[PDB]
Amino acid sequence: GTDAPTEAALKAERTFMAGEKAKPGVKELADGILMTELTPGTGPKPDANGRVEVRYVGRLPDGKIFDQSTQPQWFRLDSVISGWTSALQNMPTGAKWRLVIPSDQAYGAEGAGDLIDPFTPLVFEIELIAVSQ
């Protein structure tokens, strides 16, 4: 119910992100997003202004699920957090990816009220079911 000093919160985010970056098989995509491939795919990749149909689980660094799909769900890439916009352009239909997204590519300093604190990196597991224009 109260915010950690930026100094401490930023340090915690940086050490979390650096730890994830060092893990085996992790690829650093644009803008600091870290990807681990659970399952490869060989289908189409989405355009920056296209749509993705996904299953997903979104977690805080301590594991807490803050949002998840209940069925495959369509999103516009130009209308989601910027970490999805950039990272998912790399993702072929059929793949299952783990993404670790720095807070400046997610909800940043503002967070999401009391649901996501300022300076919180996010961990997603995403299955790409389909893409479209």
Please report, for the chain, how many H helices and E strands are present, in that order: 2, 7
Q: Which two tokens stand for residue 109?
A: 């300093």
Give the fold, CATH level 3, of 32-133: Chitinase A; domain 3 (3.10.50)
Q: Which two tokens stand for residue 86?
A: 């950039």
Domain ranges in the chain are: 1-31, 32-133
Distance CA 74, CA 33 (A): 21
Handedness of CA 38, 67, 105, 21 (dihedral sign): negative
Number of Cβ atoms within 10 Å of the Cβ of 17: 20
Structure determination technique employed: X-ray
Number of Cβ atoms within 10 Å of the Cβ of 62: 7
Distance CA 84, CA 46 (A): 11
